[PDB]
């Protein structure tokens, strides 16, 4: 439903939040679509990366 076609849009928009944070891969110019994400749920995250 928008710019969230491309993974970058999740990483920027998380970086706008008060206390949630995200960082792009240091391995290169990935910029993949969100359409090709893999099936995963309830990844317990706070003091992790």
């Amino acid at each position: 439903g928008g710019a969230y076609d491309y993974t970058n849009a999740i990483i920027t928009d998380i970086n706008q939040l008060p206390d949630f944070e995200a960082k792009l891969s240091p391995f290169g110019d990935k910029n993949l679509e969100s359409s090709k994400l893999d099936k995963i749920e309830n990844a317990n995250i706070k003091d992790k990366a």
Binding site: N8, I11, T12, N15, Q16, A22, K23, L24
Partner: protein
């Protein structure tokens, strides 16, 4: 301040008086800050360093 400068540049250019701005943030900014600031500064007649 950068959003205001973008706004002032738009206000003058839409009135027929063209203007442009070049902007850079803080010290030693990282990639995540540049993307997040570009997305918050997306209009033309503005450049980010």
């Amino acid at each position: 301040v950068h959003a205001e400068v973008a706004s002032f540049v738009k206000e003058r250019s839409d009135a027929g008086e063209p203007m442009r701005a070049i902007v850079g943030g803080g010290f030693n900014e990282s990639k995540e800050q540049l993307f997040g600031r570009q997305a918050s500064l997306s209009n033309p007649r503005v450049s980010l360093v």
